[PDB]
Ligand binder design. Sequence first.
Ligand SMILES: [Ca+2]
Ligand SMILES: [Zn+2]
Length: 388
Amino acid sequence: ASPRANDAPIVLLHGFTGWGREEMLGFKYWGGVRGDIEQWLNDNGYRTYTLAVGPLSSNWDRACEAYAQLVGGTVDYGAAHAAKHGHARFGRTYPGLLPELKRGGRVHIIAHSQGGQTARMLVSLLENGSQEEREYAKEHNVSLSPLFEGGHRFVLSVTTIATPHDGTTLVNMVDFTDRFFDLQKAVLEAAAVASNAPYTSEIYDFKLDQWGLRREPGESFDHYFERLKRSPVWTSTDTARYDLSVPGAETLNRWVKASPNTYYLSFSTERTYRGALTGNYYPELGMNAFSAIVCAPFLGSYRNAALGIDSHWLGNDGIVNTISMNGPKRGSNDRIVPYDGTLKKGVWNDMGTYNVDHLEVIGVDPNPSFNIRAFYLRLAEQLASLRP
Ligand SMILES: [Ca+2]
Ligand SMILES: [Zn+2]
């Protein structure tokens, strides 16, 4: 007897990896080899859509891209921001998935991994806009996107799954630059295997129009990734790379605060066991191969006393430190409350820690012990019970 109190639609938002439903030959980021999560939700009475923003781009850019995809229009990164980092101010044009948001409509956002930071930033911007963009618009007499005006609050809830709210120490790996792109390649091969196709036939658009970056005809991904490593999308502070780091996440937390008008839910993940003598953390059986061999070992043993990255930071889901996921803590004043049966707004409702890794939670990597269908159907039911 679920007391559904709202019929607000749901939009899915990926992390530093992710593509649209028309990409990767149909292999879904949200569902992977387990199925199509969006389809399951729609079939069960929950109108759901999928967003696709720049995977390697800054959370700010993604938020601007997300805004346009929701209400329609040309992406506007902000005159001040664009002049500050040296990339185009305008991007792609979208028809808009939910134009009714500009007229009283509300929406639920479910985000995975880095997508959780993006969702939080979208809310902050919608509610307060941006002074820097406002003040700059005056001085130079240029148009201003409504996103930076503030005063728009059509987001009802934000749910984050395995989000590095306080960053991830993976960024500190000595060869992180090459390892990060090997991860991108690992996902391409996983999709390619699932579809019985050569990974060279995959379609994966990184949406780097603002930087003038695009894979050239005939150019392989391997060659494209090499160009990316030396580009602003990897060497500037306006990148996912920077926002993923512990200090970048903290900088993010200083201004991106929880709105008192929206419900925040967070899900933590873990797939490692503790070593009795060493005290370090190791990958459990079943963790996707790339993480188990390349990432988890480092995540489960890297410490940094100067920054308080201690033994409580070693548990992880193969990509992000478990302690970073339940809510913003570093440089933040947001309140985190353990789920006690009732969801509260303006605070982070810690929904618990689940025994699944970073990719198993979205279905890209198998795990028969994880009833992924029930997990998401139960989440949708909870979001549908929230009163506006
Ligand atoms: Ca697995
Ligand atoms: Zn930017």
